[model samples]
Target chain A: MIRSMTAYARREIKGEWGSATWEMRSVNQRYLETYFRLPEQFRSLEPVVRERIRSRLTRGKVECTLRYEPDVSAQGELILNEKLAKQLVTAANWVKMQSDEGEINPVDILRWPGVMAAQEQDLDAIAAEILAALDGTLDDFIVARETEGQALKALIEQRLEGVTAEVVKVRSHMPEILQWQRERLVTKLEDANNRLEQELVLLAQRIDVAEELDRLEAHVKETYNILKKKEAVGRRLDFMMQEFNRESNTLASKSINAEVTNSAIELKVLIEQMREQIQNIE
Target chain B: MIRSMTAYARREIKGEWGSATWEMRSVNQRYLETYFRLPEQFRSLEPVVRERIRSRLTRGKVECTLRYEPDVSAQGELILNEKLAKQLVTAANWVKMQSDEGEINPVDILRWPGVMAAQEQDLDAIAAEILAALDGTLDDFIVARETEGQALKALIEQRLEGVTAEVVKVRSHMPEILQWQRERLVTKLEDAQELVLLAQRIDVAEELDRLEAHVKETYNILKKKEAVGRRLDFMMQEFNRESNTLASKSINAEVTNSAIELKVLIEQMREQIQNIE
Candidate 1:
């Protein structure tokens, strides 16, 4: 259900009008931003284009381009319009007889409006075809985003499992770490009752990562849910990255054992990986 | 002309069609290698792309990507094309009339041929535009290479001059080194032939002469304005051998330290030469 803000979709449409290519691609953006590279004739259609994209995509820097080339097979052949050419020919003939006009130039007559048609090009017709092509291209583009998005989600999920495993390592290693500390304290302070109990309480309070671990587990759960959420999960997951980093930092600072310190470093590495992937989400 | 095999160039072109950004970057390699992350439709243009890069470049692992964005105003409207919808209606009406079936659903007709349309996004036109942009991007990329190339050349030149000064120091101090060895021989007690053999054994004059010649040759090679890395590295080996000889033969502390200094200068030049083409 996740989607990344990076993808591309390009397609071609061909007919008697020759061909036109529509290329669409997007990258991560904090807000929905759309840009277009269309033939100058289609510049006015940006408003309609924005309406289309805004309906489907929530956030990204999206770009779409359209390129066109006219048919070459229809070149060098002009289909004369009989009715229009007749009127122009009649007028030329009358003007030649009445005025000081020379024999009518064939080139001049060919250039007359609606007289001779060399190419069949209608912008409205091509624009309609392009609009339809845009829809199909958008379909593929969205599919690509979701596909990459799923891939990113899987990568982050792997790191989440790593973070959980490190948490488990810290738990198991914590017991030995406390046992050594308690043994050292007892040897230093003999025949101690209230003093020894207070020392033990202080040790537990100073190095206890139980609260940090609970919060970390909570953040991981929230991330999994956000991956499946129907909206933009980037900002939410980005916040989770900061939280994970902070908890890892606390784990590092409070550690007295080598294994706990190493686990904290591993957790940070996993957190950084997740942070990198989270920015790619939409 | 000399050049480094590292550079980066990124540019953006904006017009009605939206905008396209071409990013080109390269790193050191044995030969010209190109990797393009162009739009999928443009994949078939790989042959042409390589041709463009090959003509302008010689050595590097290069990556070029053209990112395109279209007009925002052109997206998201799904118009109801009545031609396909009308045809679907025709088929359903005929079926219902013949089979005498129940009423048709409103949603089903919206889904049918001529039913939809969108890219090989315009390959010929975009291909031409993309090719034109390639030349522009390569211009920046190659210029940056030459720009950094001159910096490396100047750096190596600095170390080369140091080698020259150390060579001169060895030449200037050799006479004093010879004098001290002769004074210690005490000619009043030693025979004439014995004195000559003693001086020959301690003499580093040949080593100093060869080292001076090597310095001049290194300077000449640096000014050649071509790929001089292989030649410079070989010169380094020559310099090291002579320095080793001089260090072994030296009896005075002054002479020994100068030989070590000469080796250090040669080693520094060698480090910079490795990065050149």
Candidate 2:
């Protein structure tokens, strides 16, 4: 199954810790390079999550964004700057004494400085919640990919079969193809008085690309088998395309008749299709 | 979880005696090629057993085959050629005579011809047992691929999104990008006052259209539940081509910057899509 390199997975996990949603969309990439956009509270967990993904994925560039809609229960903590508050109070009192103005009001003064603070937060719990949501998001992501993979499978199999049918058609005509080539070559040599018969035969033999065609058929068959294999066979299939190309090129170079040349050209078209398709299969 | 590259599993408990399947495919070049013809004993595994396939599996060629069967199951089975057997016996005798005549016997005589032989066995039972049990082998093969594909699936989805985001980011500056290009062109080619700015802008628009189209097609393919790796790869190439054009045609600093960004994204997409299956 050839899964496309593009997919999107989003999940919103609502739990006691807090409600959070993860939106992850990945496009094709040379390797897994993940960009994380999270709330400040969740920033510290980026490395931990990114590492887990990196170790699992061999390729792709992924962006994971974690959005936490904090509930009232998550009223974030704040810390007071005591030194700054004291400096502000001292400055206010000195100004009042210097100007012989009214006494500095503590309540008013406290409001003017960093005297109040919110409670501290448990980052560990926040991290855990985000990671948990990530797990569910990953599940959705897999489902999306699997569904897409089935489609890829059908497509590749279809194209590969198309190539197969073409090769089979060509294979059946190979004998006549050889005869036509011989006739064409002989006709061309007819006008040459110095033509060597043995050399002509040798050239004829060399120009007969039956073996290359046979190998191409073999390659097509093996490609089908690998399509059924459904593993990390993309690289191998790609290598096979090289062999197919080799045969197609040989057939083209050896073509002595127009029909054979046409057939060889068709082979080229098939090879190109396969060549283009294999890059998508992993 | 991404499965390991090397995996091995065998089922021998079932009546699939003497049945074996070996499937090996790798990423080497741009096309599929292979060598194998498994006998009937392993034939049943042919239908369903396959390597990991996915939408983005665009490059690697695969080679997988089965090997199994026995001879007694065939309509006619023959053993030994009488002429070869006789030749073998005569050669043995001659070798002994040569030894008696003080001619040192060459060790190659035993292996010269018809020295070793194969005998017919109960291939019927072997074939029957192996063929019947091949379904399980195929199941296991699919499972292996599925597991591996799942891992690839995760990786590819991640990359796909990255490319999409980059495109979105770059797209936001389209107007400014064009304006900057016009400015840069005016500065570089003002001496050629006859140069057509509209022509250059049209080319830029074409490049933008292509890039946008590639990304749009990619998005649609990703949305579809099908094998899209090939499509994705094709789109990636298109994206690369357009990015190259943009890079080459850019007369502005911002356009070049965006062009470079586009190339990076295309390269990323190409790499991730290569192993989609």
Candidate 3:
């Protein structure tokens, strides 16, 4: 199944430790490019998260941001430096002995630097959960991409069939176009010179689109085959777009009849629409 | 973005090992109802796929199908049971030795039951791949949904604005409606002064005010960033109710025309709101 390069998926997990939220937004791009905004504590998760996204997506400019709030009560214990407090107490006694002036309160000592120590929050568990939740986020993200891709596939497939129909329409009109071109050439030749028979054959050969039509039909079939494949066919579809453009251009350049010229223009429009949609495919 | 309840998304993957296709279709429904058409091999994927769909869509009748074909060559290796083949060979030789009139062919022994074994495909691996691909397919499915949702949002938003305009238009004509109702009552009750005074109290101000308030509430709900389908659906019903009251209470041709037009706009908006989620 195809996947669209545009989608959004968000996942959040809350626990006693902390809550982690992952927001992913993707837009169509020529290739996969990811930008991350994670908490300073979870910076190490960027690479693994990027790899997970890369594994799932092939084309898009994806922005992934993480919001994490740690539960202060569940973080860890804060310890007071008892030795520092005792040393401060002795110093306070010395100060009191030296001068019977300002006294250092025990509460003041607790407020001093190094008097208390705070254990940093453990991030391993949180990181593991964040990574797992990120997987879930990507799963949802892929579902979004897949859902859009399905719509795009239906849309592009419709246009692909449309291009095929135009090609057939042009092909079906070839004999009549050639006949009209020949009649015009014959009428002009009769009004001027006498080699009408020879000029009619020459005119038919000049406007002949059997080769171009065959190639267009072949490209249409090849596109259908590519659509059926289960791998990334963006580049292949890109190449087919060029082929379609070339065939349409040739068909237009070779046209001596208004209906054929209009058909060529119609084909170009269909090709352009297909190309526009192909850019969104992965 | 709001999504239209009607949508379709189909994905097919062709490989050397055969092909798998996922087809999903949905239509507007009052509540979500999902159905599945999967081969027996892929039946286990139904619940997970259904859950994924349920997570994204709120209301629709979604039908999903899976078509899988296995590669003949890569399915598994066909093994020849040496013991069974040897036993068949011995039995065939004994039959040949016992009856010289009819000789048993060595090839015939290989065709006997239990002489050969054909291992089935590795269903577990295939199931895993199918599940992963289904994830991909769902991604595409959502893109289609989102794209259509975006379109539906714009469409309904426009209609919502139209409804707001209609409400304002009706409100602007309220004074005229009451004045016309007063004049008509006075003209009809030239001889009945007490009846005319009583009829003057029967005004459409309350219904017009309610319609205007409902329209404002609808506008506020439309501005909300979350799924407001249920709220908007209820709001539409309120809009209809108030419009119906306004229409019923309208006095003059101008007021009646405005009220009817307001109802028409409300109906159009309500029809579109039904498709939103």
Q: In DockQ terms, which candidate is top?
A: 1
| Model 1 interface CAPRI class | incorrect
True contacts kept of 3: 0.00
What's candidate 1's DockQ score?
A: 0.01
Candidate 2 C-alpha lDDT tens digits along B57-154: 33344445556432344434434445534443443344333223223233333332332334435555565555545445445644675576566656
Residues B98-148, model 3: lDDT tens digits: 232234455555554345557546678677777778777777776777687
Q: In order, what DockQ does each candidate have?
A: 0.01, 0.01, 0.01
Best by lDDT: 1
lDDT by candidate, in order shown: 0.69, 0.54, 0.69
Runs with alpha carbons beyond 4 Å of true place in candidate 1: A72-126, A186-193, B1-277
lDDT of 2 at A69: 65
- Candidate 3 chain B weakest ten by summed lDDT: B192-201
Residue A132 lDDT (model 3): 79
Q: Candidate 1 chain B: worst 10 consecutive residues by lDDT?
A: B192-201
Clashes of 2: 82
